[PDB]
Write a protein that binds this ligand. Structure first.
Ligand code: HEC
Ligand code: HEC
Lengths: 131, 131
């Protein structure tokens, strides 16, 4: 497959219409993950960039010998992701988050999350483990 | 509304089964923007934290005069977002990306993104401006 003929001016227009609300184009590189100006990461230099979702189900979490170069934002993957982001995530990493319907489970999760703070004993324990 | 009674141990187990795949619990503070250890941001100290999606649809024509991130991850918002993230996004920021059906528009977008690079003439101008 080769990237078919397209119009980059039309592309700028479509980007301002559909993507600019959540994505910057600034060449920060310090914004390539989430960033500080836009919600989503800067899409500058995104072409052939290693995708952030490569870190989902990180093999590094259990061992540094399981390094993974990850998924690349080449032409095909950009086209497919722009077609259907959720199906792309599910098909490339194995699953996505569509929400938890049960209310007690979500409440229990909130109770757990409230302990992940710099003041809670459990949170203080998580802190020293990473210091 | 008050947070109903909950079990933080069951919450930890639910977090490990449903959230740890894409979320760290590391006190990085710099990882709150997805960081690098995980695809999603660290959920450590996420309670009552300003949500990253507050940065979407930013009035950058009056950026110095009108900007005050104000989606807070309090109990209610966490429960709502965990129930249906996409509906939460759509109802709190106004819209969400569900994909572009047409193939030529996506191709044109890829053509525009290929010019966002440190060596393309257009990408060079974007660099010049934002420094
Ligand atoms: C909010 C309403 C968004 C709109 C509209 C678009 N995107 Fe987005 N995208 C958004 C976020 C918060 C994130 C980060 C979390 C995630 O799911 O990855 C993204 C991610 C991307 C990426 C991945 C970048 C990476 O470094 O891995 C790309 C390439 C991307 N988004 C492109 C993109 C395009 C082409 C859009 C319009 C056609 C678009 N996004 C809209 C939030 C939002
Ligand atoms: C990947 C498959 C994920 C799973 C499973 C869960 N989350 Fe996540 N979440 C993910 C990303 C890539 C992002 C950043 C982009 C975005 O849409 O915001 C998030 C974001 C959050 C946030 C916002 C944090 C902030 O700083 O604003 C929260 C509070 C959050 N996610 C919570 C959460 C919970 C409770 C989960 C399991 C029950 C969970 N997420 C799963 C990706 C993924």
């Amino acid at each position: 497959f080769v990237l078919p003929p397209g119009d980059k001016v039309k592309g700028e227009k479509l980007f301002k219409k559909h993507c600019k609300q959540c994505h910057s184009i600034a060449p920060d590189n310090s914004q390539t993950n989430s960033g500080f100006t836009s919600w989503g990461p800067t899409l500058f230099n995104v072409y052939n960039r290693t995708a952030g979702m490569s870190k989902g189900n990180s093999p590094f979490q259990t061992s540094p010998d399981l390094y993974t170069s990850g998924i690349i934002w080449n032409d095909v993957n950009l086209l497919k992701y722009m077609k259907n982001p959720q199906q792309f995530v599910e098909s490339h990493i194995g699953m996505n988050f569509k929400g938890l319907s049960n209310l007690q489970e979500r409440v229990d999760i909130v109770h757990y999350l409230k302990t992940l703070t710099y003041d809670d004993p459990y949170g203080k324990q998580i802190v020293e483990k990473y210091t």
